[PDB]
Amino acid sequence: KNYQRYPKPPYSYLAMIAMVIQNSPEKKLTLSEILKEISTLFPFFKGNYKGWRDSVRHNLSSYDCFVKVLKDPGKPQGKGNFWTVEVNRIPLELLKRQNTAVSRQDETIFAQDLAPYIFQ
DNA sequence: AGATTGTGGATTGAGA
DNA sequence: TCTCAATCCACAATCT
Ligand SMILES: [K+]
């Protein structure tokens, strides 16, 4: 296994997932839809590194703020479910812009905090 | 068959 | 020097 860090946008995966969910019409998205919407946020995600898609999937399950909503309520073991975000479960500091080489390269193109786009 | 989803074991390494 | 978000991977389902 060859671990590598990539020049991803200077926001946590949690923050970006939460932003796309909260800015969707029904405040819920399938994994496939989350991945498509994240890809539109920054050109990085359209590049040839695709492992971020795995990181997003991992994050949905690992953080308690993301709550699966069954696509079919009679199939609790079905997949392709919707995901929601409970903002009162978000660790607020994970919504701040990160201090990384990417943000230091160009601070002005990155909002300092995503909380205004996630909380009502 | 086939591709994706949902969850977790585990290591990595820059920011702090 | 220590934290934990980032990242790579297996597993075991469903999906097709
Ligand atoms: K979760």
Numbering used by the authors: 90 to 209
Article passage:
Forkhead box H1 (FoxH1) is an essential maternal pioneer factor during embryonic development that binds to specific GG/GT-containing DNA target sequences. In contrast, FoxH1 recognizes the TGTG(G/T)ATT sequences in several cis-regulatory elements, such as in Gsc, Eomes, Nodal, Mixl, and FoxA2, to confer activin regulation in vivo.
To decipher how FoxH1 selects GK sites and how the extended domain contributes to DNA binding, we determined the crystal structures of FoxH1 proteins from three selected species, H. sapiens, D. rerio, and X. laevis, bound to a 16 bp native sequence belonging to the mouse Gsc promoter containing the GG site. In the FoxH1 complexes bound to the GG site, Wing1 and Wing2 are well-ordered and, together with the N-terminal loop, they contribute to specific recognition of DNA. The Wing2 region also interacts with minor groove 1, directly with the backbone (Gln187 to A6′, Asn188 to A16, and Arg193 to G15) and indirectly by guiding the N-terminal loop also towards this groove, where it establishes several base-specific HBs, for instance, between Tyr92 and A6′, and between Arg94 and T12 and G13. These interactions are well-defined, as depicted in the snapshot showing the atomic-resolution 2Fo-Fc electron density maps of the zebrafish GG complex contoured at 1.0 sigma.
